[PDB]
């Protein structure tokens, strides 16, 4: 009775709004008024204001809806979003974010703003600066709500990802400062989104983000240690990937500055149990092709003796072997000779792994097999003068 | 639930940007060591550069198609603003130039059907000769 009429009623609203002739289509009529210079500016303002109420009205029903009627409201919503251009859609909606008092509607509103920019180009750069500023200004206010706090960060991540470099520098720096403060948020979702924003912001800024370097890497390493302890966290996999992808982002953008803290980077990669091996092994290949091999070989000795040797973790041991074989096959002849005492010091430790290893015979035999092939590669690619004392 | 979905979507976004070929989020130990070592060379041989190109192209087509829609749509409404302005005598300087161009464009085309002046010289003479004998009227 009542529900059937509403199902028909939203079909009725859908039929009118549907963009199935210039005079018929509501979308084209809106453009003509905007294009028409003689159209009164006050008339334009009414169009913006009416749409905002219209957009809020449909969202109110969608939030508070019935499967068939739920679908129809989205058909109505789809028509509504295309009524007016991106220029006026931003002007008519961004003020409404502060006006709206419902957490659900604000959550709905943030998503649609992002969707409009999914298919735009460089024409929206001045608009996006306005959108980013509003999102930044609201972020302190929605610190209470997790879902809205996370969604605003995600939309900023997309906007920085797409034509982020073209955006004005002040917003990018302000966005990075915002993210680093929110990395410490107790909610895991805010940590994941904050880490994602830092990765994109650091990619855009490059070296210019070095000022924030103390606020990105040292906290992230500490975050990883807490991640291992809290194995019950339902988002443990996503959090561990987020930390890993952060390093992958800055391993490609600031290799020289991360060169000092490379040891903690390797610690994250090896002991990130939740992350899949393919992800960990891929981020390893970035280290070899971007960071100086001389320091990796020096660090590989320290990490083995301290952690990996007593770890008794198969994935950690296998990943360590993958790094070591990659470095030796890529290290230059000059670099190999200079770091020869360190590698042989590591090699003697590897030969002794059988004494302390808790694995069975087949594994230790397999591990030793790889140790010998890398050694032959490294002993080759040297000269008699350097190798005679070592032998 | 949305918290889980939103977190995964953000992370999956980073994976494509930084590690394209790597998949997204959704026994004897000796065997495990070997598989990881084999995965190293196989991942190294993957043609990641091709994967980036496909993602770039599919996105480019969608943007290009949408851009054409705006260009095609605004041209319609631009023409209707002309139609109302010319009817109400609200014709602007720019509007008065576009229409004047159309006069040149259409008149230029009709010149082809108008034919050359030289042929009209001979055609006219032939026309008079045919007409004078057929119409007569000398009497």
């Amino acid at each position: 009775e009542f529900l059937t009429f509403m199902n028909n009623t939203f079909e009725f609203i859908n039929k009118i709004t549907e963009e199935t002739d210039v005079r018929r289509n509501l979308r084209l009529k809106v453009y003509s008024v905007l294009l028409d210079e003689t159209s009164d500016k006050k008339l334009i303002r009414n169009i913006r204001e009416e749409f905002g109420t219209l957009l809020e009205g449909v969202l109110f029903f969608i939030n508070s809806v019935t499967t068939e009627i739920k679908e129809i409201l989205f058909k109505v919503l789809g028509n509504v979003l295309q009524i007016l251009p991106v220029d006026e859609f931003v002007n008519a909606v961004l003020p409404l974010l502060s006006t709206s008092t419902n957490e659900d509607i604000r959550y709905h509103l943030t998503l649609v703003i992002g969707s409009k920019f999914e298919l735009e180009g460089s024409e929206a750069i001045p608009i996006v600066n306005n959108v980013m500023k509003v999102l930044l200004d609201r972020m302190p206010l929605e610190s209470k709500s997790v879902v809205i706090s996370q969604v605003i960060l995600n939309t900023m991540t997309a906007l920085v990802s797409k034509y982020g470099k073209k955006l004005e520098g002040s917003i990018l720096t302000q966005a990075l400062t915002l993210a680093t403060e929110k990395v410490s948020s107790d909610m895991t979702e805010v940590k994941i989104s904050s880490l994602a924003l830092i990765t994109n912001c650091v990619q855009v800024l490059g070296v210019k983000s070095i000022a924030f370097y103390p606020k990105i890497v040292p906290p992230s390493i500490k975050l990883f240690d807490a991640s291992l302890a809290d194995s019950s966290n339902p988002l443990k996999e996503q959090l561990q990937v987020a930390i890993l992808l952060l390093f992958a982002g800055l391993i490609k953008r600031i290799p020289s500055f991360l060169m000092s803290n490379i040891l903690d980077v390797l610690h994250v990669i090896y002991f990130s149990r939740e992350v899949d091996s393919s992800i960990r092994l891929s981020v390893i290949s970035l280290i070899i092709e971007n960071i100086d091999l001389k320091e990796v070989l020096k660090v590989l000795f320290r990490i083995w003796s301290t952690e990996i040797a007593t770890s008794n973790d198969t994935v950690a041991v296998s990943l360590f072997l993958s790094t070591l074989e990659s470095t030796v096959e890529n290290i230059d002849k000059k670099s190999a000779t200079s770091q020869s005492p360190i590698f042989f010091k590591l090699l003697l430790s590897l030969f002794e792994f059988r004494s302390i290893s808790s694995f069975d015979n087949n594994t230790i035999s397999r591990i030793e097999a790889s140790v010998h092939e890398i050694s032959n590669s490294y002993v080759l690619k040297m000269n008699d003068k350097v190798f005679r004392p070592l032998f | 639930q949305t918290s889980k979905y939103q977190a995964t979507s953000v992370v999956n976004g980073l994976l494509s940007n930084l590690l394209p070929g790597v998949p997204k989020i959704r026994g004897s130990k000796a065997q495990l060591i070997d598989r990881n070592l084999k995965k190293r060379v196989q991942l190294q041989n993957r043609d990641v550069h091709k994967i980036k190109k496909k993602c770039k192209l599919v996105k480019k087509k969608k943007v290009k198609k949408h851009k054409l829609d705006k260009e095609q749509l605004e041209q319609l409404a631009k023409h209707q603003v002309l139609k109302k302005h010319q009817h109400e005598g609200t014709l602007t300087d720019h509007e008065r130039k576009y229409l004047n161009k159309l006069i040149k464009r259409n008149s230029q085309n009709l010149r082809s059907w108008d034919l050359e002046e030289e042929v009209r010289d001979e055609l006219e003479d032939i026309q008079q000769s045919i007409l004078k004998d057929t119409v007569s009227t000398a009497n």
Partner: peptide, 24 residues
């Protein structure tokens, strides 16, 4: 004819996020 018959036969992104929130 039955043999011929056998031969004849032989020859929105916001939408998903929107629903999930309603479930919560």
């Amino acid at each position: 004819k039955k043999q011929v018959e056998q031969r004849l036969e032989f020859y929105l992104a916001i939408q998903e996020a929107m629903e999930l929130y309603n479930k919560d």
